[PDB]
Amino acid sequence: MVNPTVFFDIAVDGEPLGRVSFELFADKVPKTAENFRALSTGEKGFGYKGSCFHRIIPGFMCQGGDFTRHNGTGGKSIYGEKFEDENFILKHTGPGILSMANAGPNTNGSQFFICTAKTEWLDGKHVVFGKVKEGMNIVEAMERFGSRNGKTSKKITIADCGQLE
Ligand SMILES: Nc1cccnc1N
């Protein structure tokens, strides 16, 4: 098995910005990796394409994936509304880490976050499942549209997404 690679093509108020790719750690967290992959291709009939990064805190993280309520209160996984914390093997070691957002134990859906700082206090409570492969520069440019309270000054969208070879 080769870990899958996913891409997001990011736009800022509709204007193309660049591409972020991610390695997904299917070898360590296959069930969590597979949910992100499938949401990124849209093969179940729903997913991330056209969704927004609704909360961006510079020096912390970029959060996205709420395609049902567009604001951090929604989303769903490919396995149902919620699924369990698969494992906490991987840690939040620094910028570029891809990890699941949640609302308590065993409440993973579709929302995720990209770290822009080390976030060690999240270790053992959010499932880490991937990392930025290319385009950390693009993540840094997104990040400049965020604010201390998370609200973005321009709309940051996933204009397109899918799986790379
Ligand atoms: N439903 C939900 C809400 C907040 C964060 N993650 C989630 N999956």
Report the distance separating Cα 64 and Cα 30, nearest Å: 21
Give phi and psi for 105, each to the nearest 5.
-60, 135
Nominal resolution (angstroms)? 1.2
Bridge partners of 62?
56, 114
> Please, are residues 100 and 126 in contact by the beta-carbon 8 Å criterion?
yes
Report the distance separating Cα 119 and Cα 95, nearest Å: 9
The coordinates were experimentally obtained by X-ray
Burial class of residue 75, CB neighbours in 10 A (0-12, 13-18, 19+):
buried
> Please, are residues 27 and 1 in contact by the beta-carbon 8 Å criterion?
yes
β strands within the chain, DSSP E: 5-12, 15-24, 55-57, 61-64, 97-100, 112-115, 128-132, 156-164
Q: Residue 33 gets which letter from DSSP?
A: H
What is the sign of the dihedral through the CA atoms of 132, 15, 67 and 53?
A: positive
In angstroms, how far is CA 38 from the centroid of its own chain?
13
For the chain, the distance separating the N- and C-terminal CA atoms, rounded to the nearest angstrom, is: 13
Give the angle subtended at the CA of 110 by the CAs of 155 and 164, to the nearest 5°: 80
Report the distance separating Cα 110 and Cα 102, nearest Å: 9
Q: Is 102 an annotated catalytic residue?
A: yes
> Please, are residues 62 and 8 in contact by the beta-carbon 8 Å criterion?
no
Please tell me which residue in 19, 46, 87, 102 is annotated as part of the active site. 102
The verdict on the CB of residue 111 being under 6 Å from ligand 1 is: yes
Q: Please give the distance, rounded to the nearest whole angstrom, from the Cα atom of residue 109 to the centre of ligand 1.
A: 6
Short-list 4, 6, 17, CA closest to 41: 6
Q: Is 22 an annotated catalytic residue?
A: no
CATH 2.40.100.10, domain 1-165, yes or no: yes
Short-list 132, 129, 131, CA closest to 31: 129
β strands within 25-155, DSSP E: 55-57, 61-64, 97-100, 112-115, 128-132
Q: Is 55 an annotated catalytic residue?
A: yes
